[PDB]
Design a protein around this ligand. Structure first.
Ligand SMILES: NC(=O)C1=CN([C@@H]2O[C@H](COP(=O)(O)OP(=O)(O)OC[C@H]3O[C@@H](n4cnc5c(N)ncnc54)[C@H](OP(=O)(O)O)[C@@H]3O)[C@@H](O)[C@H]2O)C=CC1
Ligand SMILES: NC(=O)C1=CN([C@@H]2O[C@H](COP(=O)(O)OP(=O)(O)OC[C@H]3O[C@@H](n4cnc5c(N)ncnc54)[C@H](OP(=O)(O)O)[C@@H]3O)[C@@H](O)[C@H]2O)C=CC1
Lengths: 68, 518, 135
């Protein structure tokens, strides 16, 4: 719980050609890219982007508490 | 400087993560000193017997408050990981600190030669007093990287066998260079480990075992490996090696002063807090600790059952999540359609996996028979502890387009439902201790075009007032606009839940909460 | 078993081990590979793991090793057997006893052997240089 921000990424691979190949148009005009997260293998894949070894560290709240 | 979540073990308590060790009395009156993953600074603690030693007769409970953590970590670092053997030469950083003193005590017993790094001359003199075995050539400066040259000189350039490093950045690199062939490096700090700083692998050409020691793992897992350290600490206690540290005793009423004194960093030894004074008796077999005045905050038992009418709605799910955090383990959530969205399914599955006995229902509280059925289900789970009423049906419009049917529809979930719940709760809910119904600022201030909503809310307030008059629990909370789930800017869910925590404790009957635009 | 094999010339053993181990990892790792593959192996350690390094290339070149792995109780070992020939004979007797006990208990089996005559030492060196030998 709480807001977590990226701190380190072990490796990111991007391949625009395969990315264009992967995209498939929805019934609406919008284009969508399927995504899969494998928390065991620490890999996130969507289209032509492949993120591995993402590390997120807890961030203290700004506690602006503008609402009193 | 440290996020609470960094502590191992999914606590989620959001509070009470400020303690690690204590020395008090067992449930039988036995003098015990213990070790707890968290929630140490408290008048009581719930600890398994595998983390509880017995205070010997010489020791006083004040002294015993220092041994557990420091000697456990020292033993686990040296004996169980570094496999220290007699005659070696080991370097222990920050000798004055508790772990340094424990490690020095352990090493000298075996016969090692010890290099220690202190911060000032007073600490050097104190350590000279404590351990006469240490010569003038067994000290260095801990605030700079000059200990490297000192150790490399007095060791003949061969280095040291063990390094109980606790420093960070450049100083850590200096410690690595002090290692000897077949050396063993024990890292008990958590800064360079966290930041993922590089470590040149060339050091491993020399046989080196670079350890990473985190005692906090045992508290939540690896129960099998723990008994080794417990046996080692008990052996040290009975043999005389484990000696209590120096203490600076503060009282419970001045805990902030103790925290500031630690923050100044001028403490030599250990800082302790006296929650309750020790009696002269060996075994008092007392009943309770002395009562104190503490800010009030809501909690719930485990055998009680709790009912949320319209719990599958926006505010209902967040209130249910909040209640679970306070010990609720049998819930009833009422909706006319049951689960029909993804978010509801996710939340209910998560709570069931956590162990809670959630149970959705379709017992429309509007009808008295439905209310009786709902209370019966809650009882089947267990005695009804509390009842919350978050149902609402909205048929807005100026009075011109209003009809009696709209009024009936809007008031059935709220006016009639509250009445039926009150009657049934009086009839067959003797252990109930919460009765909360949610109203809107429209009831008080009046928001144009919500007349039926106002009438429904206004009725719910009168029932709550009457209940509280007859000695029964009752509370109508008047909310404004809830944001995440008039001239009143919306409100974050966290702030709403904090205010609700405040409200449930007040002696009053109807309370309100909103945020003013500009 | 058939599920216990992977590929040694690629960084894919990381995924195989993590998947078949349930995402936990492997308690003890004996590594003799290069830089990228050494990093791949390190990411396979589980909590309270142990890393036994027998290679030399990364050690000799002083490649950087992230110290974040030690947040877990991972222990990193640099294993060189040559230290015994120069000193620590009293420690070497322990390994000697281990090997003798293994031999007498049948655990120690000889490897498959390829024989070259003394006059053909050059051919033996060439054959091992190729890298097709097993045993
Ligand atoms: N493996 C694990 O997970 C465990 C970790 N530890 C670590 O062991 C170390 C010893 O902890 P502990 O016994 O509480 O030590 P203390 O907090 O009592 O003292 C630490 C030492 O750091 C130096 N220091 C300088 N300024 C300060 C300051 N403001 N506050 C504290 N220390 C200061 C001093 O040594 P000097 O005279 O050289 O300036 C001091 O004696 C810590 O780094 C702790 O995190 C402890 C147990 C378990
Ligand atoms: N959040 C806000 O802005 C404010 C709301 N309030 C009150 O606080 C509570 C907050 O919940 P809210 O966010 O409005 O919830 P919703 O907007 O989700 O609607 C009410 C919830 O109760 C259920 N419900 C409604 N009528 C009945 C009924 N007759 N029997 C059983 N279940 C019923 C609904 O599910 P289903 O439709 O399937 O029955 C729904 O889950 C409500 O009681 C509301 O009146 C007042 C002030 C501010």
């Amino acid at each position: 719980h709480g807001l977590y921000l990226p701190t380190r990424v072990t490796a990111i691979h991007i391949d625009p050609a395969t990315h264009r190949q992967k995209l498939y148009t929805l019934q609406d005009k919008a284009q969508v890219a399927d995504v899969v997260v494998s928390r065991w293998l620490r890999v996130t894949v969507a289209g032509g982007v492949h993120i591995s070894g993402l590390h997120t560290e807890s961030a203290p709240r700004r506690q602006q508490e503008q609402q009193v | 400087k440290l996020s609470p979540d960094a502590i191992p073990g999914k606590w989620t308590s959001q509070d009470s993560l400020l303690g690690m060790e204590f020395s008090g009395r067992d449930a039988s009156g036995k003098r015990v000193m213990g070790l707890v993953p968290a929630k140490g600074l408290a008048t009581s603690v719930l600890l398994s017997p595998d983390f509880l030693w017995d205070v010997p007769s010489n020791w006083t409970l004040e002294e015993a408050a220092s041994v557990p953590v420091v000697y456990s970590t020292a033993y686990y670092a040296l004996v169980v990981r570094g496999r220290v053997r007699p005659g070696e030469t080991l370097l222990i950083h920050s000798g004055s600190g508790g772990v340094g003193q424990a490690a020095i005590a352990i090493a000298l017993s075996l016969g090692c030669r010890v290099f220690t790094t202190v911060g000032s001359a007073e600490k050097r003199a104190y350590l000279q007093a404590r351990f006469p075995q240490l010569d003038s050539t067994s000290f260095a400066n801990s605030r700079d990287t000059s200990f490297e040259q000192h150790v490399l000189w007095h060791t003949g350039g061969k280095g040291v066998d063990l390094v109980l490093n606790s420093l960070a950045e450049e100083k850590l690199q200096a410690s690595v260079r002090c290692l000897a062939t077949h050396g063993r490096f024990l890292e008990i700090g958590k800064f360079d480990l966290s930041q993922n700083h590089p470590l040149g692998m060339a050091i491993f050409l020399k046989n080196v075992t670079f350890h990473g020691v985190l005692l906090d793992a045992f508290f939540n897992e690896s129960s099998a490996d723990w008994r080794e350290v417990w046996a080692l600490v008990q052996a040290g206690i009975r043999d005389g090696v484990v000696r209590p540290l120096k203490c600076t005793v503060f009282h419970g009423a001045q805990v902030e002063d103790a925290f500031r004194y630690m923050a100044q960093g001028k403490h030599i030894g250990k800082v302790v807090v006296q929650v309750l004074a020790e009696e002269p008796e060996a075994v008092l077999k007392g009943a309770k600790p002395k009562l104190m005045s503490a800010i009030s905050k809501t909690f719930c038992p485990a055998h009680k059952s709790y009912i949320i009418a319209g719990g599958l709605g926006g505010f209902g799910l967040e209130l249910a999540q909040w209640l679970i955090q306070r010990g609720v383990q049998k819930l009833v959530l009422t909706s006319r359609s049951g689960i029909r969205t993804g978010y509801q399914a996710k939340q209910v599955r998560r709570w069931r996996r956590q162990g809670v006995q959630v149970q959705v229902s379709t017992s429309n509280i509007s009808s008295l028979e439905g209310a009786r059925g709902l209370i019966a289900e809650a009882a089947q789970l267990g005695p009804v502890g509390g009842v919350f009423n978050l149902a609402v049906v909205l048929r807005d419009g100026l009075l011109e387009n209003q009809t009696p049917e709209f009024f009936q529809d809007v008031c059935k979930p709220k006016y009639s439902g509250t009445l039926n719940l009150d009657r049934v709760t009086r009839e067959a809910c003797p252990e109930l201790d919460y009765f909360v119904v949610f109203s809107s600022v429209s009831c008080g201030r009046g928001n144009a075009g919500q007349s039926n909503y106002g009438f429904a809310n206004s009725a719910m307030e009168r029932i709550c007032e009457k209940r509280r008059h007859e000695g029964l629990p009752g509370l109508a909370v008047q909310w404004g606009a809830i944001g995440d789930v008039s001239g009143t800017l919306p409100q974050r869910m966290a702030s709403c839940l904090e205010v609700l925590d405040l409200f449930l404790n007040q002696p009053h009957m109807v309370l309100s909460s909103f945020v003013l635009a500009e």
